[PDB]
């Protein structure tokens, strides 16, 4: 029922736009059965409704080839109605149309050039001779002829707005030519069909904005007044101002636009005077709509405002929106990023009685946004917008528009070689070959990043799953940790269980906890936020917990998002352990995290991952299931893993075949992953030193080392050391031992 | 203005939004504003002599007004337009429904009883939303792109009790639009065990609001505070979610450290505002998750944030002592470590009721497993009673992890099966014992001895 | 022909002395379009509504002479985050910048450039697509880059044949 | 101050306690201080216009 106002209806008038094979600008073609259903005679005057409140008058014609549910209309009438192929328009006969006494027409400026002869005699006189062509105010039509075709726009009609251009009517082309930019901008206007992913929100806004205007008798019959105040809130770039422009373009009511800061003035009482003047002008032209963009700029809390002028402005807005004298058919809309900064008295019935949340779209919503943004864009046949919608996860409409622009710019970059910037004109063949392919969209996706995440971006060193040796079970679990809830949400609903979204890494240093996090940032198809431990902490009494609150709110907007806490023991230590921690600031940060991971809020696809060297000091609440419910122990590699680690490090390096990596893993027993990497790095340095000495020796006679050999690995092994001692291992094994001993029951088996 | 009022006497002057032109003169930096306040004081003084002139003022920030304007002879009489009770809410609904055409199905008494924190603007919004819902119900018959509406649709149009129920479902007081959070749907049946704790919670809220006079008759006052202390994952927050959904009162949920602010005086103002917000919407449940963040032992360290950590707890104690008697604000604090809770927080008159949420015993663990698997398809051969005895010390979240791990193993098996089926072209209806068996080997106990 | 509107926002960030202002000056000189230079502290005033009026005056001057390029140097001081800023005037300045750069009335022929040393101090709403969609990182040059910088700064100076600029570039 | 100095060219602009007027923007929390620092940077950048005035600080 929420989106019922959006749902289309099949009606005798409602038919689909189709191209016209031979119909000219002033006539349309319809199938005979459809005309018989409508009871319209051939040649009768009809009125065609279009989008963004546009109308056109044409002469109906009967053609067999025309589809029954379609109108055959050429490009000119489509540009008149601002419609496209496949669009729905409604046809209604024109009642009591009369021949125009005088019609004034203004041609486009880009067309009038190159035509030395008089426009009227050459074009309008034969076009409008013995034709009785109907025209409407503001319509643009094309007349073939001359050196260049000339487009005419009818600025004025007498009688307005429907009239017939009879041969007696005086047609004059005198006046200022219409700008091409004006026509282009008028065609490229935002409508309700230019908003995607906000279907329910659009339905609500239409219920408040369009329904009372279209059918005022309905609310009068039911004896209530509709809502008169709308507050649009959401993260930046979700489309609030876009909805404002669409409402302005597609409403018959008078639209007054107020920007936040423009109210302010130096003179005392002049800002309140500006607000009063805006509201009075809106009331004078009732019904009217007022939009206050950036409402939080001029509507803060009066209890928290130091300036007297700002508080008086808020009070003036309160009085104007709901005071002793009530508004007369005035709708007030507002858009804000922070609805909570708005004064509470401004959020109630009578002042912004409806709050509409323009949130982050889902996969289908962002697919709709991509389809909207790519309609004018030229695309190849291999472009798959569903895949692009799937790859983008936390993107909002602004991010998707940026992605489309980047793809088009990448196509232009591909065609950079053929063209020359110094040249005045571009070759026509390059223009025709220009098309955006799926490769451009893939590159844009590679460069794509949600705008909310641009502060929390780090350059990851591009670690692949194959760069990590061993840890096969951990790799499999981490891949299924993100993939399953996002690629198979239907499976979880079928079993009716909430996915597990917490993982903790603990183990001796150098065993791959940070390496696994790097692989997730590259391989997992989700947003990634990397947080160093103490970066969230701040000197101020509130920022330390505020920064924790902001980073989790950022991850909720970008869900699916992986929140990796490196060195978790710094952020989350035992509460109450140490006094003098900034007056308890350290304990309050831990308490903030507890509510963010699990509290009085619904769960999103935010996967918190932590890596710690010391899990014994981490707060037990942090380790409770529902917060890092999976504790994965990353131990020192065994012999089988050590050959994998050696192979992974030396995979991109030239190594002599005689080197036996199996013996290296056999000899090293307590070495960590970083220890095995140090052996390989030492071998390179010895090989680099040997090569440098070879070229230095080769230079002296004037006045080698194609690969790493065994003698390099043998010399590198005598400097090798075991970073993790047997004493340190016992601490990690004890934590694992306690966890295993905690469950008891050995191996769990059901009876019989 | 005053001269025009005196000229046409008797006269009434209504100054709407009085705090706009009547701030405190000491706090006002501007010269024109101070001169306006002084002019208003002089005008009121002369008005006492002026013949038959009454000045009325309306404001939602009475404390912001200059104190001299509230003395004797200047705005001496003050009228408090408060939040209506049930009968007042019924009167407001009858006023706002007199012009609206209603079906005989609608019962305004139920709607009046169900809107606890509404002020009357909220009730008018509810009526408008119900009428809009009726219009939506007819929007299937009548579409927006229509030249006219059929008279049959106009005649059939009416507001039934279902539309009012929908409006009530969407209804929320405008006072609490800042504090509203999205709470998961948690019924009392979602919570397994804690039967005695559920009974105590329902009686501690329902009895004071439903039957106040008996407490007066018996010479006893209801307890205004409850502290939930226990091991992590045993259902302290889950009980709050059930209260937020099933209890018939307004709910304000507070993350612990969200109140504190770097600016001087803002942290105590937030505490003062949040308590005032709940009082306007009484009966209201004020819940503090992780109470030990704000209610911590004073004197822990010298290096406090300018002493602000100790001032906030003092403001909380001041707010709790101020509220009493007819005001019905239940303060529930869930703490994970109750030892670091400041003792003054737990003294009589402030959160004196202490409820211990323990680790579930064997019978409770059966209820916990059943509640988690209530909506889940599980094989009948799976014996949940056996799981309870082997999961000796497992908490409520530990048992939920077992169920979630078993679900994932079932999801894993199905995905490799659908991959296999696609391969042969070029399953797992329910969770079984083996899925629970493999999941049980990864199971751990989070609360230690 | 490709049917997209070209990006109209640029943010240059890097350590001081990297060459953001120099690049802005070069773009101003060699573009052949109306160039308006804005410095952060200069717009701001004590009187209420004067900073925003200055912003409108600059942007409408650019709109009058379209196509135009606007360069805001030291964007960090003019536009801090509104959630973290207590003062009302700074918040209203940021809101006015957001409205001018992207609002219900779009700007078609105007390109806005900005330079800052700390990009993370900027208000997040400024960094989205439509206001500052592309952030260009002017960073520390490598050996060849600083070699050609030495060649640029040594073209007017009188240099003997003894001078080798490649060595100097390698030393720095 | 800079405008008067440039009018009185040649001149020496002397800024006593430069540390109080221009601290580190990241270190300082007050907006006005980084505001002053940015203005000072702009003034120095514009100073080198053959104005024959030299700015000095203590
Ligand atoms: N749902 C959507 N459908 C189509 N296009 C969208 C949608 N959301 C955003 N866009 C596009 O992305 C941009 C959004 O800019 P807009 O001014 O509407 O954002 P906003 O939410 O008002 O931002 P801010 O809060 O910073 O004012 C526009 O280019 C618009 O075309
Ligand atoms: N399983 C592994 N496979 C390959 N290389 C590994 C592995 N484990 C560790 N390394 C190597 O260790 C080095 C860095 O280790 P890493 O950052 O993952 O350690 P960590 O477990 O996070 O330890 P720390 O506690 O010191 O932060 C790299 O050289 C990496 O190649
Ligand atoms: N008795 C129970 N019945 C059903 N589910 C339960 C029960 N106890 C706990 N759970 C589940 O385990 C988790 C408990 O989390 P909850 O927020 O209730 O913990 P808490 O006791 O408040 O502890 P914390 O101090 O860690 O915040 C939830 O996922 C909940 O569904
Ligand atoms: N990439 C570069 N190439 C040549 N000169 C440079 C470069 N970067 C900086 N400079 C020198 O630095 C001076 C200007 O620095 P400026 O760009 O104002 O620093 P900032 O980027 O901090 O504003 C110029 O005199 C110029 O010679
Ligand atoms: Mg906007
Ligand atoms: Mg590490
Ligand atoms: Mg809890």
From Swiss-Prot, chain C:
Effect the entry attributes to changing residue 82 to A: Does not affect methylation by VCPKMT
Modified residues (N6,N6,N6-trimethyllysine): 84
Effect of residue 81 to A: Does not affect methylation by VCPKMT
Subcellular location: Cytoplasm, Cytosol; Endoplasmic reticulum; Nucleus; Cytoplasm, Stress granule
Residues reported to bind ATP 1: 16-22, 117, 153
PTM annotation, UniProt: Phosphorylated by tyrosine kinases in response to T-cell antigen receptor activation. Phosphorylated in mitotic cells.
Subunit organization: Homohexamer. Forms a ring-shaped particle of 12.5 nm diameter, that displays 6-fold radial symmetry. Part of a ternary complex containing STX5A, NSFL1C and VCP. NSFL1C forms a homotrimer that binds to one end of a VCP homohexamer. The complex binds to membranes enriched in phosphatidylethanolamine-containing lipids and promotes Golgi membrane fusion. Binds to a heterodimer of NPLOC4 and UFD1, binding to this heterodimer inhibits Golgi-membrane fusion. Interaction with VCIP135 leads to dissociation of the complex via ATP hydrolysis by VCP.
Function: Necessary for the fragmentation of Golgi stacks during mitosis and for their reassembly after mitosis. Involved in the formation of the transitional endoplasmic reticulum (tER). The transfer of membranes from the endoplasmic reticulum to the Golgi apparatus occurs via 50-70 nm transition vesicles which derive from part-rough, part-smooth transitional elements of the endoplasmic reticulum (tER). Vesicle budding from the tER is an ATP-dependent process.
Associated disorder: Inclusion body myopathy with early-onset Paget disease with or without frontotemporal dementia 1: An autosomal dominant disease characterized by disabling muscle weakness clinically resembling to limb girdle muscular dystrophy, osteolytic bone lesions consistent with Paget disease, and premature frontotemporal dementia. Clinical features show incomplete penetrance.
Family, similarity comment: Belongs to the AAA ATPase family.
Record remark: domains: The PIM (PUB-interaction motif) motif mediates interaction with the PUB domain of RNF31.
Protein name: Transitional endoplasmic reticulum ATPase
Portion of the full sequence shown: 232 to 403 of 806
